[PDB]
Amino acid sequence: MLSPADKTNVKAAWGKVGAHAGEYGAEALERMFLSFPTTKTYFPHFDLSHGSAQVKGHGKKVADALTNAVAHVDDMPNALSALSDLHAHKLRVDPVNFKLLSHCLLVTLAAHLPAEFTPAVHASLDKFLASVSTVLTSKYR
Amino acid sequence: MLSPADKTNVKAAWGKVGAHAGEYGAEALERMFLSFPTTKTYFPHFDLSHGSAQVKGHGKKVADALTNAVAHVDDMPNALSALSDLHAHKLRVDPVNFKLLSHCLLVTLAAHLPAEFTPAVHASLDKFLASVSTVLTSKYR
Amino acid sequence: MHLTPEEKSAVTALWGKVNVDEVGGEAYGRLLVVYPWTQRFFESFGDLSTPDAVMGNPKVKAQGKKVLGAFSDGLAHLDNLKGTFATLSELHCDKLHVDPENFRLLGNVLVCVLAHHFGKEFTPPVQAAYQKVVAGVANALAHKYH
Amino acid sequence: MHLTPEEKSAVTALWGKVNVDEVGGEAYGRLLVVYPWTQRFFESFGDLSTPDAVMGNPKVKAQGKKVLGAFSDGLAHLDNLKGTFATLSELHCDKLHVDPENFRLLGNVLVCVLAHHFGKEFTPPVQAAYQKVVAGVANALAHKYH
Ligand code: HEM
Ligand code: HEM
Ligand code: HEM
Ligand code: HEM
């Protein structure tokens, strides 16, 4: 469960992200593919080289959906319902890979927010990311 | 999420366990200690020899909690509140270890209930145990 | 790798009583019912809409048979799993695109099936030796991923 | 223990710039804050209730010092991590009773702290070499568990 301080930390960190959302979603994906090569098996139809526009474009879509979850932080299962259905019944990503992207997302945030990534906020963001992960894998079985 | 059919299947398998709940709980533990030896790190204060009274005692307590959970499947968070408090602030078992115990739990039931362990009951039991792990670790942070 | 002489003999004696086609069918079917996201590779296999259609699917039973025959022969090369499964490892990654996490999931369904099949002869120590082997094979198949 | 020339270089040059005592103190402190159940080994460290109390606790900083230092010596023996860490592996199992999964958690926290500290020179490829290394050292520390 996210506390009031957790919600305030996530909305403040993500407010700072702002208009870089998309760019940071793409860097997070690149970090993931290079650190954990088994995650490339869900993307055989994509150019995964450095600089790829398909990665960029997927970047933004992942980014936009986080923004929408942050804006609906008290009502997530409803805002991400369409998303939950697409991963469970179509893409079918093993739930294990959601922790790997969450880690990489955190690393990306750390590298670009030297001031806002305190111990407290790191904790809140990890909790926020695991909650999105749970919601996204809710309908799998 | 546990559907209506999962709850009917777990109450059916668990009723069949009936009176051996205690003994199967002890066997599940011994299987865990032998197959995944890192789980012994949480029990340095125990005599872990085959059939020790401490291992038998703990098997019965684990069994009883599961029975409580099947009885209150519609309200697990409220029914396991005390236990989930204990694991989050006192025992503090890493959450990965709940999947090893659930696995061994599964294997114990397979070996002792040849008639009842069909493919749908296996699926309902694994979801159910996942749900119980999820309620026990929900207050961790 | 690295079982004791006791561990190898236990794995081999049990394996001598197994019907490889029947168990392969049961294990792979339960993989598909219990963890339904593993069905993602298999839309061409037909009806998988309920547990009974899955377990009854003939395409599912032949995949099971192929997969368990390969496992079965790997049991003879306990000393060199990595060399034995090198080419298959490369194939699953470059061509089939199979997440190696699915090998872990089949290994645990396999161990549940052996217990359901053999009941009391699937003692804790026999289980322990089989847990090491299914992780060893999962590790050998993921080895050439890149 | 297998790194490419590019990976070894990336690892060694960045570690040349790390102040061990400082990175150690921060990485271990964030471990206790972000995954509070790791606080079960450290009841004797005193006040660990809020983030601030964890981050300026002197015993927390001294432990991080100790650990990262030993971590740093292993970076000199990258071709034989299991033989370098065998004695500490035994100690962690037989006398400290530490769940080896704790080693993976610290590995991810350490990577977050390097990114936070070095910013944009912790690029994706450098992260990937560090991810290999921390996985190696955690596997080396768990080697002698039984
Ligand atoms: C926080 C976690 C995640 C979020 C918020 C997320 C969000 C999304 C979104 C918004 C889309 C586009 C859907 C559309 O077109 O309407 C998508 C597609 C996709 N996701 Fe996820 N996703 C997450 C995790 C993952 C993970 C861990 C993987 C696998 C490693 C993954 C694999 C895919 C794939 C393969 C697609 C389809 C891409 C395409 O061909 O266009 N997702 N996801
Ligand atoms: C199905 C999941 C589990 C359930 C239902 C469960 C339930 C219980 C119960 C009912 C107790 C005793 C409470 C008391 O006497 O006050 C207990 C204690 C304990 N549990 Fe859990 N547990 C689970 C998983 C685990 C796991 C995975 C571990 C570690 C590998 C673990 C380690 C312990 C320990 C060390 C104790 C205290 C032992 C003692 O001093 O008697 N539990 N648990
Ligand atoms: C013990 C683990 C496994 C072993 C030893 C194994 C071995 C094999 C073998 C021998 C083949 C046929 C190779 C050929 O065509 O020459 C194969 C094919 C295949 N495997 Fe695996 N496999 C295993 C696990 C899995 C799992 C868990 C999945 C997916 C959930 C998977 C997905 C596939 C697919 C999709 C094919 C292609 C079949 C076809 O084209 O008809 N494998 N595997
Ligand atoms: C990079 C991984 C690690 C390395 C290289 C490492 C190394 C060390 C070293 C060199 C010591 C000093 C012991 C002595 O004086 O003989 C130590 C002690 C200790 N370590 Fe580890 N450690 C690691 C991770 C961890 C983790 C993740 C935990 C728990 C979450 C842990 C728990 C302990 C404890 C409880 C002690 C005893 C400290 C005391 O006296 O309070 N270690 N470790």
Label each residue of C45-113 as H, E or C.
HCCCCCHHHHHHCHHHHHHHHHHHHHHHHHHHHCCCHHHHCHHHHHHHHHHHCCCCHHHHHHHHHHHHH
- H-type alpha helices, A36-118: 53-71, 76-79, 81-86, 96-112
In this structure, the residues whose C-beta lies within 6 A of any atom of ligand 2 are B 39, 42-43, 58, 61-62, 65-66, 83, 86, 91, 93, 97-98, 101, 132, 136
Distance (Å, rounded) from C-alpha D10 to C-alpha A34? 14
Sorted by sequence, the CB contacts under 8 Å of residue A19 that are 6+ apart come out as: none
List of chain B residues whose C-beta atoms are within 8 Å of the C-beta of residue C119 = 111-112, 114
CA distances from C136 to C79, C146, D133 (A): 11, 19, 21
Sorted by sequence, the CB contacts under 8 Å of residue D66 that are 6+ apart come out as: D24
CB contact under 8 A, C118 and B111: yes
Distance (Å, rounded) from C-alpha A30 to C-alpha D69? 31
Ligand 1 atom nearest residue A45's Cα? 40
Distance (Å, rounded) from C-alpha D136 to C-alpha D82? 9
**Thinking of the domain A1-141, which architecture would CATH place it in?**
Orthogonal Bundle (1.10)
How many other β-carbons are positioned within 10 Å of the β-carbon of residue D83?
Answer: 12
Q: Give the closest-approach CA distance of B80 to chain A in angstroms.
A: 16
| Structure tokens given for B91 | 């025992």
- C abuts D (3+ Cβ pairs < 8 Å): no
Cβ atoms A87, A136 nearer than 8 A: yes
**CATH code, C20:** 1.10.490.10
Helix (H) or strand (E) holding D45: none
| Residue A58 labelled as part of a binding site | yes
Cβ atoms A36, A101 nearer than 8 A: no
Distance (Å, rounded) from C-alpha D62 to C-alpha D30? 14
3-state secondary structure chain B: CCCHHHHHHHHHHHHHHHHHHHHHHHHHHHHHHHHCHHHHHHCCCCCCCCCCHHHHHHHHHHHHHHHHHHHCHHHHHHHCHHHHHHHHHHHCCCCHHHHHHHHHHHHHHHHHCCCCCCHHHHHHHHHHHHHHHHHHCCCCC
Most distant CA pair in chain A, distance: 41
List of chain B residues whose C-beta atoms are within 8 Å of the C-beta of residue C54 = 119
Residue type, B22: G
Listed residue (B140, B122, B124, B103) closest to B28, CA to CA:
B103
CA distances from C38 to C21, C43, C99 (A): 20, 11, 9
CB contact under 8 A, A111 and D55: no
Ligand 1 atom nearest residue A100's Cα? 27
CA distances from B133 to B22, B103, B105, B129, D140 (A): 19, 12, 12, 6, 29
Distance (Å, rounded) from C-alpha B33 to C-alpha B40? 6
| Structure tokens given for C6 | 């006791």
* Domain regions of chain B by residue span: 1-141
Ligand 1 atom nearest residue A32's Cα? 30
From the number of C-beta atoms within 10 Å of its C-beta (0-12, 13-18, 19+), residue D79 rates as exposed
Domain of C55 in residue numbering reads as 1-146
In A, residues 12-51, which contact C (CB 8 Å cutoff)? 37-38, 41-42, 44
Distance (Å, rounded) from C-alpha D111 to C-alpha A32? 13
Experimental method: X-ray
How many other β-carbons are positioned within 10 Å of the β-carbon of residue D108?
Answer: 20
What does DSSP assign to residue A76?
H
CA distances from B27 to A118, B60, C27 (A): 45, 10, 23
| Structure tokens given for D139 | 């596997």
| Residue A112 labelled as part of a binding site | no
Q: Using CA coordinates, name the residue in chain B closest to D32.
A: B141
Last residue before each gap in chain D (C to N over 2.5 A): none
List of chain D residues whose C-beta atoms are within 8 Å of the C-beta of residue A101 = none
Out of A123, A139, A141, closest to residue B127 by CB: A141
Q: Using CA coordinates, name the residue in chain C closest to B35.
A: C128
